[PDB]
Design a protein around this ligand. Structure first.
Ligand SMILES: Nc1nc2c(ncn2[C@@H]2O[C@H](COP(=O)(O)OP(=O)(O)NP(=O)(O)O)[C@@H](O)[C@H]2O)c(=O)[nH]1
Ligand SMILES: [Mg+2]
Lengths: 120, 16, 202, 982
């Protein structure tokens, strides 16, 4: 709570199992953009419903690129290099889906607005 | 007959 | 502070899928019959500290039964699982309970009816009564929609710790940290693969 | 041989270890257990080992040897293992350290002894029971463990025998224990009266609980055992829990004698006095006790609720006449009242089932309800405060009880609800949760008061509920109350029907709430609107006094501004609601024009689009145009849903263009599959196109399923539909075929299939062979086509069986393979459709008579069906369909023992001429079972088949013989005389 909530959205997060070519669910819950009041850096923290376990915890790096999935108008895919949700910051290729195309678009703007702030 | 009640509910509102 | 949990039930009811949902958040669509037993460590965070479950996911089918009732030794809590879309899995619940309370004869047990997400429900609510005289706690659960999927563990956690007011709480979030082209290869293959369950609400 | 010390480390790495080390010790401990001759080394582990877990695992290896290969052993192995086990148990009962710290091992040892008794007792062990009772006087530890032996024996013989042993074997054991019980009961009663070891007393009671599941009644009522359970053993918390379960089982036992009645009153009297003085008084708040969860309080409170309800539901009448028993009766019910306030839902369902039993009796039986006036008065508040949102099943039970209580006394129910409402207005009990539950209660008793009392009650509740909304600030607060008002007014239709001016105001208010952006309000407004329409349809279709037109015309004409800010799914509900009203108009021309006016907006949008899309089109690559089309069709589906046969004029306005749109959408899906591959079927653009096709099919299915003019269905509807959908299905790649096409054809065939024989032939030709190849490589791919495939074959086999006779012989052979393919599914819907099609098929062939087709069918496929049914019956992987398998098998067998198969089932070249089909059937079956189950003896197979065929006209007995066969194939050496059981 040493942060401020830039944006909050309901979403379901996927991780891609390379050695399988299948997507795997990782969590359903509230996805939040948290900007730290001390360092002004913004991050992704997403907790799963009821158990309240973290399934996404990484910095919105300005290097990351949001690209759509072949079979979804309401999803974004991006590669992540340092995620510490289970401990140990490892690289993942993530998909995130929302309830509508309106939210997936609104996510894409706030994700870019947070990417700017992150480098000042 | 009860138009006394109908006009109260016609006034039911959620905003303000 | 760890407790051993035996998970028993007929083959296909959802024991293995239910545990994978708590360890990785994954939902497995394929039925790979568990062989003997798979032991997994599961940890929850409560207002009374962390609690760890040594989950002994046992085998439903008899051909893969393994040790059978040998897996139950020194268990501290248990989950009996059945299929609300399969009458035969509920008919066998007294068989599973009979083997279980011959080895562990006063441990807290939860009875779970899985797959309430499926419309064509075959075991109606009013018919499920076996838990009443055997002092079992019952929950309608679904590993696919995550309906009541935390209730069985929260109940066992409250009995083994001894506080009826125990609750699950939020992990603290550590601050996140801040020659690669094989990442843009495995990326585009990820774009080529459609996300599963595109019709679901979320 | 065995390095026993190595074993004791394998087992310890398994139970107490972790990681890959435990996973490897796991897979080798299983390999040791399932070695077929590891039982020979159980000799050593049981006597040399220091680890009790190894002695447990070794007793597991013994149990599998005893249950399945006992009678194959040489005799002196059978007595070497017996004498051992008996000796090991005796050995562990004198060591007071092993008897108190190794309970798991002694119980597993007693179970293994009981497995031997099942095989050997009493025919080869007549001394067991008299010997077991002499040993009981030698040691308190042996007396207790012998109670564990007897408890486990009663369990395996009476409680878990029906599935595990043959009817003859179980009957033999039940008779054996019944003849020897007078001896067991003498010892059990002695231990209970002479004390004093608690661990011995509890083990005795836990075995008495098992006996009550059948022992005659004279052992309980004609001894002093009832006063012992109802007094001496209720005082100590060690024996209390199990004693309560025994008195619960006694309240269900096998009753005219006037003295058994006083004993049934007596033990109930003693039990609840002990509860009053030794546990807690009647006024204790059991809600807090249960919430604190101290010790076994929760388990005890659960057992008290089970004991009270069980006894009260059976013997309530024994306490209602005599006035000396009145305080006992109502005190027992006051405990139930206190138990009913415990917040634990599974327990609440237990007591609520009894309350239902009670208040039903008071509502029907005379001169009863005055006894329980104070009980019922409390029960009223208990349920009003725990009303759930309308589990769906728990609400119907809460409503049923509350409705009964309102009939028993309207006036008290009315004031509790008004008092609870006032305490909401003053704010002492105000909560979002508390105002919702109160509304659900006020809504549930609707229609039970008299019409004029209900009138005065509704206005009082609605009036005061309106002031609640005026007084609250904030939308979250006003939205909760506004929703509860609409729920209540929707729950009282009989009041709305008689006061049109008030009804007119509510609807205009729901229309107002539809422009509200707040969460859930629009969903509440639409749900309440259609809920009011179903119950007051008539008042919108007639010209209400002092207005100029039916209110439906007013609703229709400004439908665009009324639904202007709803979501499409909410708009579809609104149109479905108007369709309900329009169907009330029974003048055809007046109904058909209300239909025209209602469909005006979607008909206008439909017309442009067909226009500016035919001529083009490419417009259907537009994401937005596809959405506009789907919602136009969906709106038609909504209105057709509630109008049924009255929808036909609107269907014709769009039918031919809709089928053309269906064709055009079929092309573009095929185009983008060709341009981008199979992954195109997952893309949003193609998924929007498949939605148009699925929604078009749904509209046609919805109409035909409800059509009344069946001549119109055949004449104008079927033939343009078949041309549009069948060929497109047949010539698409399997990953673009819509399984809804099968479902549509099922609805068509089910209603008009008897009138379209050539149409059924063309349905089979286009979908049978190509869908069968989609689903005949595994049991997984295309679960939707799988289910719909066999729903279609089922109805075709029921309604147009001639279609299967016009199949080429190679295709008919594929039909039979698909029916047997369905047998082997574990998927429930596929498997029962499969067995049904087979059963419906042999009856279809039976009613053909003595004709070449019927004869050739029996020559080619009779034994295939006999053997495929025998396979799923005896493989333990399809036990959910045992009933349908047994019945299909019985029809197959009876066909031969009634000489309904005229041809010989064999080839003349393989058996003496003149041999009856019955004799060859017993030979084919005898050979088949011998190759499939080689460990069966020849006498087993002969006696089983002898019993099975002479019983092929008695299903219940037939099933018992199949069940006996399923037990004997799980072991070696079963007695063939078990099939003479009936
Ligand atoms: N619709 C639905 N399917 C479920 C649900 N839970 C599990 N399944 C499905 O049921 C099937 C059985 O999965 P599984 O977890 O292996 O059951 P099991 O009891 O562990 N089998 P076994 O006892 O032989 O090891 C899987 O295909 C799974 O997708 C559920 O909640 N809903
Ligand atoms: Mg499994």
């Amino acid at each position: 709570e040493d942060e401020e909530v830039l944006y909050k959205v309901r979403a379901k997060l996927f991780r891609f199992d390379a050695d399988a070519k299948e997507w795997k669910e990782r969590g359903t819950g509230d996805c939040k953009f948290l900007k730290n009041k001390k360092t002004n850096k913004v991050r992704i923290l997403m907790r799963r419903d009821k158990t309240l376990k973290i399934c996404a915890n990484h910095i919105i790096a300005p290097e990351y690129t949001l690209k759509p999935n072949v079979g979804s108008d309401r999803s974004w895919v991006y590669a992540c290099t340092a995620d510490i949700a289970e401990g140990e910051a490892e690289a993942f290729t993530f998909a995130i889906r929302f309830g509508s195309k309106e939210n997936a678009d609104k996510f894409k703007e706030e994700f870019e607005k947070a990417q700017e702030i992150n480098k000042k | 007959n009860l138009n006394e009640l109908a006009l109260k509910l016609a006034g039911l509102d959620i905003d303000e | 502070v760890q407790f051993k949990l035996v998970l028993v039930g007929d083959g296909g009811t959802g024991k293995t899928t239910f545990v994978k949902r708590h360890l990785t958040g994954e939902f497995e669509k394929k039925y790979v019959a568990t062989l003997g037993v798979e032991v997994h460590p599961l940890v929850f965070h409560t207002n009374r500290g962390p609690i760890k479950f040594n989950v002994w996911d046992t085998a439903g089918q008899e051909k893969f039964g393994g040790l059978r009732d040998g897996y139950y030794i020194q268990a501290q809590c248990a989950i009996i699982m059945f299929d609300v879309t399969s009458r035969v899995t509920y008919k066998n619940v007294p068989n599973w309970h009979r083997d279980l309370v011959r080895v562990c004869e006063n441990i807290p047990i939860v009875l779970c009816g899985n797959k309430v997400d499926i419309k064509d429900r075959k075991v109606k609510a009013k018919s499920i009564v076996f838990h009443r005289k055997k002092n079992l706690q019952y929950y309608d659960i679904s590993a696919k929609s995550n309906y009541n999927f935390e209730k069985p563990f929260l109940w066992l956690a409250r009995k083994l710790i001894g506080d009826p007011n125990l609750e699950f709480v939020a992990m603290p979030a550590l601050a996140p940290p801040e020659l690669a082209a094989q990442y843009e290869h495995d990326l585009e293959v990820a774009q080529t693969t459609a996300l599963p369950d595109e019709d679901d609400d979320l | 041989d065995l390095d026993i010390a190595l074993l004791d480390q394998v087992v310890s790495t398994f139970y107490q270890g972790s990681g890959v080390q435990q996973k490897q010790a796991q897979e080798i401990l299983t390999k040791f257990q399932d070695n077929p001759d590891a039982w020979q080394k159980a000799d050593q582990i049981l006597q040399f080992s220091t680890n009790p877990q190894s002695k447990f695992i070794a007793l597991s290896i013994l149990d599998k040897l005893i249950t399945r290969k006992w009678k194959l052993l040489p005799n002196d192995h059978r007595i070497g293992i017996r004498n051992f086990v008996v000796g090991m148990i005796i050995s562990m009962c004198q060591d007071d350290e092993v008897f108190k710290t190794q309970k798991n091992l002694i119980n597993k040892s007693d179970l293994t002894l009981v497995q031997i008794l099942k095989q050997e007792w009493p025919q080869n062990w007549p001394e067991f029971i008299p010997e077991l009772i002499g040993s009981s006087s030698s040691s308190v530890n042996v007396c207790e463990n012998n109670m564990i032996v007897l408890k486990l024996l009663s369990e395996e013989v009476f409680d878990f025998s029906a599935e595990q042993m043959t009817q003859a074997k179980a009957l033999h054991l039940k008779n054996s224990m019944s003849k020897e019980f007078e001896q067991i009961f003498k010892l059990c009663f002695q231990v209970l009266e002479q004390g004093s070891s608690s661990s011995l007393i509890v083990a005795t009671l836990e075995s008495l609980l098992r006996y009550l599941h059948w022992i005659p009644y004279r052992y309980i009522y004609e001894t002093n055992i009832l006063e012992l359970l109802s007094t001496k053993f209720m005082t100590s918390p060690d024996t209390r829990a199990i004693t309560l379960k025994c008195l619960t089982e006694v309240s269900n036992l096998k009753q005219d004698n006037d003295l058994i009645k006083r004993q049934t009153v007596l033990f109930f009297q003693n039990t609840l006095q002990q509860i009053a003085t030794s546990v807690m008084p009647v006024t204790a708040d059991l809600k807090a006790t249960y919430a604190n969860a101290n010790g076994n309080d929760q388990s005890f409170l659960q057992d008290l609720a089970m004991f009270l309800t069980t006894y009260l539901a059976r013997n309530r009448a024994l306490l209602e006449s005599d006035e000396s028993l009145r305080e006992l009766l109502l005190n027992a019910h006051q405990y139930l009242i206190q138990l009913s306030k415990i917040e634990e839902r599974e327990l609440f369902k237990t007591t609520l089932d009894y309350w239902h039993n009670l208040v039903a009796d008071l509502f029907y039986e005379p001169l009863k309800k005055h006894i329980y006036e104070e009980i019922c008065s409390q029960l009223r508040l208990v349920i009003i405060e725990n009303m759930v949102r309308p589990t769906i099943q728990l609400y119907k039970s809460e409503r049923e009880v509350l409705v009964y209580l309102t009939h028993l006394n309207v006036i008290d129910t009315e004031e509790i609800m008004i008092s609870k409402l006032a305490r909401q207005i003053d704010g002492s009990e105000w909560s979002w949760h508390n105002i919702n539950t109160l509304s659900w209660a006020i809504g549930s008793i609707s229609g039970t008061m008299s019409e004029d009392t209900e009138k005065r009650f509704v206005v009082t509740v609605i009036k005061d509920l309106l002031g609640l909304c005026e007084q609250k600030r904030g939308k979250d607060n006003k939205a909760v109350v506004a929703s509860d008002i609409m729920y209540v007014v929707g729950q009282y239709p009989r009041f709305l029907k008689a006061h049109w001016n008030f009804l007119r105001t509510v609807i205009l208010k729901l229309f107002e709430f539809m422009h509200e952006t707040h969460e859930g309000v629009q969903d509440m407004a639409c749900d309440t609107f259609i809920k009011i329409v179903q119950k007051c349809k008539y008042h919108f279709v007639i010209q209400q006094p002092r207005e100029s037109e039916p209110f439906i015309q007013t609703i229709i004409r400004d439908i665009q501004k009324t639904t202007a800010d709803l979501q499409p799914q909410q708009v579809h509900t609104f149109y479905k609601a108007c369709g309900i009203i329009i169907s009330e108009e029974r003048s055809v021309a007046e109904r058909n024009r209300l239909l025209s006016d209602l469909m005006q907006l979607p008909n206008m949008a439909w017309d442009t689009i067909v226009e500016q899309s035919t001529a083009n089109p490419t417009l259907l690559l537009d994401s937005e145009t596809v959405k506009i089309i789907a919602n136009i069709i969906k709106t038609n589906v909504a209105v057709c849903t509630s109008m049924g046969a009255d929808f036909y004029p609107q269907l014709g306005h769009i039918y031919y263009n809709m089928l053309q749109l269906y064709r055009a959408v079929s092309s573009m899906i095929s185009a983008q599959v060709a341009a981008e591959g199979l992954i195109a079927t997952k893309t949003p653009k193609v998924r929007g196109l498949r939605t148009i096709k699925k929604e078009i099919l749904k509209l046609v299915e919805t109409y035909i399923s409800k059509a009344r003019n069946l001549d119109d269905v055949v004449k104008v509807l079927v033939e343009p539909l078949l041309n549009a959908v069948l060929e497109d299905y047949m010539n698409n790649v399997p990953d673009a075929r819509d399984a809804e096409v099968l479902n549509c054809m099922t609805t068509v065939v089910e209603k008009v299939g008897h009138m379209i024989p050539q149409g059924v032939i063309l349905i089979l030709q286009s979908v049978f062979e190509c869908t069968l190849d989609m689903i005949n490589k595994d049991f997984t791919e295309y679960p939707e086509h799988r289910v719909e495939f066999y729903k279609l074959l089922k109805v075709i086999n029921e309604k147009s069986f001639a279609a299967f006779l016009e199949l080429p012989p190679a295709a008919f052979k594929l039909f039979v393979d698909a029916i047997c393919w369905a047998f082997k599914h574990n998927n429930r819907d596929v498997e029962v459709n499969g067995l049904q099609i087979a059963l419906d098929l042999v009856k279809n062939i039976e009613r053909m008579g003595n004709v070449p087709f019927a004869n050739e069918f029996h020559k080619n496929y009779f034994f295939i069906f006999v053997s495929e049914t025998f396979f799923v019956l005896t493989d333990s992987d399809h036990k959910s369909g045992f009933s349908k398998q047994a019945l299909l098998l019985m029809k197959l067998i009876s066909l031969v023992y009634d000489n309904k198969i005229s041809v010989p089932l064999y080839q003349e070249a393989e058996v003496p001429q003149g041999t009856s089909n019955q004799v060859y059937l017993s030979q084919y079956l005898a050979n088949m079972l011998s190759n499939a189950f080689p460990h069966l003896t020849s006498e087993q197979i002969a006696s089983f088949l002898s019993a099975l065929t002479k019983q092929c006209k008695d299903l219940v007995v037939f099933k018992g013989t199949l069940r006996d066969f399923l037990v004997q194939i799980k072991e070696v050496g079963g007695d063939p005389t078990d099939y003479l059981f009936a």
